[PDB]
Structure 1
Amino acid sequence: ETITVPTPIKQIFSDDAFAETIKDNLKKKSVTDAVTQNELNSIDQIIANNSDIKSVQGIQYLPNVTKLFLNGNKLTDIKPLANLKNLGWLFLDENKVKDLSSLKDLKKLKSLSLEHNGISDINGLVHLPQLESLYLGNNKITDITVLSRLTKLDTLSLEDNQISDIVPLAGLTKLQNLYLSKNHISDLRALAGLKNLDVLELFSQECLNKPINHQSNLVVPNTVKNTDGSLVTPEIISDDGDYEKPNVKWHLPEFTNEVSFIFYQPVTIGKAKARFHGRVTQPLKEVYTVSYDVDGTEIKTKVEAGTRITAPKPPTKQGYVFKGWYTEKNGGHEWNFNTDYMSGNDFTLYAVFKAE
């Protein structure tokens, strides 16, 4: 990771776009110009955003680089950064850097920006407990458990991800600037202790409940909670629904496959004011009953409309053989459970037996 003779820039920096970056940084005339290690040692900062860089191979020869601005390139591989011991600021927004293993030994890193990288797994950040600012907006993150270790952060952006569980933030009392808009957050209790906040964003949450069956009268708990656990009164409820704390209530005489409610709450945490607002969506399943009649009385099964019915364990009667389930007692046709999926209405099937 050192040169000992004068060496052309392009021999070290194999990506032509990055070779041009170094040429301009060192005020050389051509990427073929020879440089010395003394010259490489003089590089403290590289600004090369939107520079069409695919690889930073060769950066390993720059031991003193402290600030690297590489937003809006084509990077996928940060292995060349792994031994840049003095790196303090690293900006990689709008790349395709998903593998974070090579950050492990960057123990002087203070600011890290990885927005718009398609990242889901941030567990590699466990190795950077000294971080002071971290920008992860516009990714695919759901699990922020690792952030409970980042107790030096004063600035954290997680906006535009898929986070519902913010409990890992609860002990991060150094936080001053926290961006959480456009996630799946319904419960602010985790934030109650963040008394040093100056800036807080909680806009535009989208929360999805697990599906339940449609019924004529539905009662769904309001799960939207303020920092003290008090429930946020809905701002508007779909489908003529009503609020009766602690529940949202609907009368749904016709099937519909979802209902929802919107919430809005001005929030104060620490010194920060924010507007916590969003939607809770409740998917509804269309479910009907198959009645299985055996000699004039029935067992019953609920099945979602349009889906496959699994036949019941068949009835047994000594001296008879079960034949099948028919749409009439003494007529109709035999139901085929492999091919005839659930009807959009309740119906009865009749057990038919035959002689041994």
Structure 2
Amino acid sequence: GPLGSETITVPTPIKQIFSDDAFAETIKDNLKKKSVTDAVTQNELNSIDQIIANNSDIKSVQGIQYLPNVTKLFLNGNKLTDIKPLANLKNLGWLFLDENKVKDLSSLKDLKKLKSLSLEHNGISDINGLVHLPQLESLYLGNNKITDITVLSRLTKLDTLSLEDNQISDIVPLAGLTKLQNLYLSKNHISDLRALAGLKNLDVLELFSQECLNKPINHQSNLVVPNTVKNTDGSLVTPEIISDDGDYEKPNVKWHLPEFTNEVSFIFYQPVTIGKAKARFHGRVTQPLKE
């Protein structure tokens, strides 16, 4: 059963258990109490299945350890950083923590019933701790600082994955995730779709607004940039529109460059069909120039 350290044996005022008054108030509401000064029993705490507390200025969930049966936690738009108090919530199934600053993800390591996790807009770069959640079904990681998604190769139960608005170029870790149905990858740095070829169960796929930044090359009148953009079959994607009246002579994008232009670009576009999913693979390759 629960740890004695995580159980109350006497009626205890809410405010003494939940150190952050915002979270204490949340519990008071959940339990329909008049005030955080009111006592609660463990039986009352055990009855909490779901906490909805978005946009509540919560800085700490200290005390939540006393809620062994909580399965759903909606905590979007708060001021959380540390999620250690969640560690032993073995029944947690849904955890929404968008718009916080949660980075220490190994506190989730023993949440083996967690099926849906949302951590959008947390400033996260390191998702390695997610390796301990192989049962995950939905994962939302939009608007973060992620580059390395290596660990996602272990999340073979995901059917929904959002990685939009990160800094990802290497999507090879996704290649074996054939259970995927909804995959959101817009606003990354993706130029090569080979990784997606086998995702036969996709229904929704977003691949637009990629930004691909090349290392600077020398400014010269006859400028050449090799096209590196690849479709799911490995073939080059012909540029859509090339800046500065440039042209494409496969495989090279070419410009007759003016002295006063110091960066060129091209937009690429490829319609993608993978199983039922139809997607716009779209982006821009930017080529800064140096003297």
Q: TM-score range by the shorter chain?
A: over 0.9
Per-residue CA deviation, residues 203-239 of structure 1 (Å, 9 max, x unaligned), is: 1111011111122212221111111112111111112
Helix, strand or coil: the match of 1:239?
helix
- C-alpha deviation, 1:255, in angstroms: 5.4
Matched, 1:24 2:29: yes
Question: How many angstroms apart in 1 are the aligned matches of 2:210 and 2:18?
Answer: 44
Distance 1:230 1:3, change over 3 A: same
CA distance in 2, matches of 1:67, 1:257: 53
Q: C-alpha offsets along residues 44-77 of structure 1, whole Å, 9 cap, x if unaligned?
A: 1111111111111000000111110000000001
Q: SS in structure 1 opposite 2:244?
A: coil
Aligned partner of 2:3 in structure 1 is none
Structure 2 counterparts to residues 120-139 of structure 1, below 5 A: 120-139=125-144
**Could you report, residue by residue, the CA deviation over 1:102-133 in whole angstroms, capped at 9, with x for unpaired residues?**
01111111100000000011111111111110
Q: Which shows bigger deviation, 191-200 or 24-33?
A: 24-33
Contact 1:209 1:281 in 2 (8 A): yes
Partners of 2:52 and 2:224 in 1: CA distance: 57
- Out of 128, 134, 159, the position equivalent to 2:164 is 159
Deviant stretches of 4+, over 3 Å: none
Asked if structure 2 preserves the Cα contact closer than 8 Å seen for 1:60 and 1:81, the reply is yes
For the aligned residue pairs, the C-alpha RMSD in angstroms reads 2.5
Distance in structure 2 (CA, Å) of the matches to 1:256 and 1:129: 50
Aligned length: 285
CA distance in 1, matches of 2:208, 2:282: 5
Q: Secondary structure at the match of 1:38?
A: helix
| TM-aligned CA distance change 1:253 to 1:8, over 3 Å | closer
How much has 1:253 moved relative to structure 2?
A: 4.6
Could you tell me the TM-score, scaled by structure 2's length? Answer: 0.96
Render the CA deviation track for 1:280-300: whole Å, top value 9, x for unaligned: 01111xxxxxxxxxxxxxxxx
Q: 1:186-205 residue pairs with structure 2 within 5 A?
A: 186-205=191-210
1:148 Cα deviation from its structure 2 partner: 0.6
Deviation at 1:263, TM superposition (A): 1.2
Contact 1:214 1:255 in 2 (8 A): no
The structure where strand makes up a greater share of residues is: 1
Provide the rounded CA distance (Å) in 1 between the counterparts of 2:74 and 2:115.
14
**Mapped partners of 1:56, 1:123: distance in 2:** 23
Q: Which runs of 5+ in 2 are unaligned?
A: 1-5
Name which structure has the greater RCO, CA cutoff 8 Å, separation 6+.
Answer: 2
Partners in 1 of 2:283 and 2:241 — Cα distance? 11
Higher helix share: 2
Question: CA deviation digits over 1:15-66, x for unaligned, max 9?
Answer: 1111111111111111111111111111111111111111110000001111
Cα deviation per residue 1:294-352 (whole Å; 9 max; x = unaligned)?
A: xxxxxxxxxxxxxxxxxxxxxxxxxxxxxxxxxxxxxxxxxxxxxxxxxxxxxxxxxxx
Shift of 1:4: 0.4
User: Is the CA contact 1:222–1:231 (under 8 Å) kept in the aligned structure 2?
Assistant: yes
Distance 2:224 2:206 in 1: 31
Alignment deviations for residues 246-284 of structure 1 (CA, whole Å, 9 cap, x no partner)? 111111252532111111222111211111111001111
Contact 1:10–1:32 (Cα < 8 Å) also in 2: yes
How high is the sequence identity, in percent, across the aligned residues? 100
CA distance in structure 2 between the partners assigned to 1:263 and 1:196 by the alignment? 25
In structure 2, how many angstroms separate the alpha carbons of the residues matched to 1:270 and 1:162?
26
SS in 1 for 2:211: strand
Q: 3-state DSSP class of the match of 2:245?
A: coil
Largest Rg, 1 or 2? 1
* Cα separation, 1, equivalents of 2:280 and 2:258: 35
Q: Distance in 2 between matches of 1:195 and 1:101?
A: 31
